[PDB]
Design a protein around this ligand. Structure first.
Ligand SMILES: CC(=O)SCCNC(=O)CCNC(=O)[C@H](O)C(C)(C)COP(=O)(O)OP(=O)(O)OC[C@H]1O[C@@H](n2cnc3c(N)ncnc32)[C@H](O)[C@@H]1OP(=O)(O)O
Ligand SMILES: [Cl-]
Ligand SMILES: [Cl-]
Ligand SMILES: [Cl-]
Length: 196
């Protein structure tokens, strides 16, 4: 999939790496690798920049919606999928980016609600390996770490591929019409209904 000069496996030991505005390299014990020629955080910044550009090309966007500089100035969390057993040994498969956002969301009565749901903001799997289950790997990992259910999410400008994905995997089919270009599904307001 996506190839980089520096040692990705040394940088990201785990299959899925979780980063936020700090862009902090995963933990490592002193001595377990020689200090790289490129600082670890610079490697991370380059990876985020390139992933965001690739996602923008996939989505036919004139500018990336994910980048190192945007990560540093926002409250977003990115989950990055890498294959530790890739061949030939070196690569990054893709990522999902989420964040809580304050939104004014319409309910099924067309009334406005001030809410702060977890939002799906950017999501990309390299073209060569789309439709192989990697998107679901990332999505599931994120749901588990964030402790949220699919119907509780808002989606920023979902693509056709993502709408199909959400219906297939999570039975998210029926939307509640919005004016803010986010999409929500039936069940979005269930928690508000129960708890207030
Ligand atoms: C808020 C946002 O991020 S909107 C932008 C979402 N990102 C994009 O559209 C970028 C291009 N697409 C991708 O990167 C990926 O296809 C993702 C992230 C949408 C999904 O990840 P994938 O690894 O492809 O999904 P995964 O293999 O886990 O699940 C497959 C399902 O996704 C949907 N899907 C994936 N590719 C396609 C496709 N080319 N056409 C129609 N549906 C598709 C289908 O529901 C499919 O199931 P099916 O094969 O039985 O029809
Ligand atoms: Cl694509
Ligand atoms: Cl970002
Ligand atoms: Cl609802």
């Amino acid at each position: 999939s996506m190839e980089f000069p520096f040692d990705v496996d040394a940088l990201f030991p785990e299959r899925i790496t979780v980063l936020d505005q700090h862009l902090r390299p995963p933990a490592r014990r002193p001595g377990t690798t020689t200090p790289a020629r490129v600082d670890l955080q610079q490697q991370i910044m380059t990876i985020i920049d390139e992933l965001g550009k690739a996602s923008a090309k996939a989505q036919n966007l004139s500018a990336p919606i994910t980048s190192a500089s945007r990560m540093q100035s926002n409250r977003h969390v990115v989950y990055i999928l890498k294959d530790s057993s890739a061949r030939p040994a070196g690569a990054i498969i893709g990522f999902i980016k989420v964040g809580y956002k304050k939104l004014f969301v319409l309910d099924d009565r067309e009334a406005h609600n001030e809410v702060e749901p977890l939002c799906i903001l950017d999501f990309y799997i390299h073209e060569s390996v789309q439709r192989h289950g990697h998107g679901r790997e990332l999505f599931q990992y994120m749901l588990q770490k964030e402790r949220v259910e699919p119907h509780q999410l808002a989606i920023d400008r979902p693509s056709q591929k993502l709408l199909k994905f959400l219906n297939k995997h999570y039975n998210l089919e029926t939307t509640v019409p919005q004016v803010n270009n986010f999409v929500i599904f039936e069940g979005f307001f269930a928690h508000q209904h129960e708890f207030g």
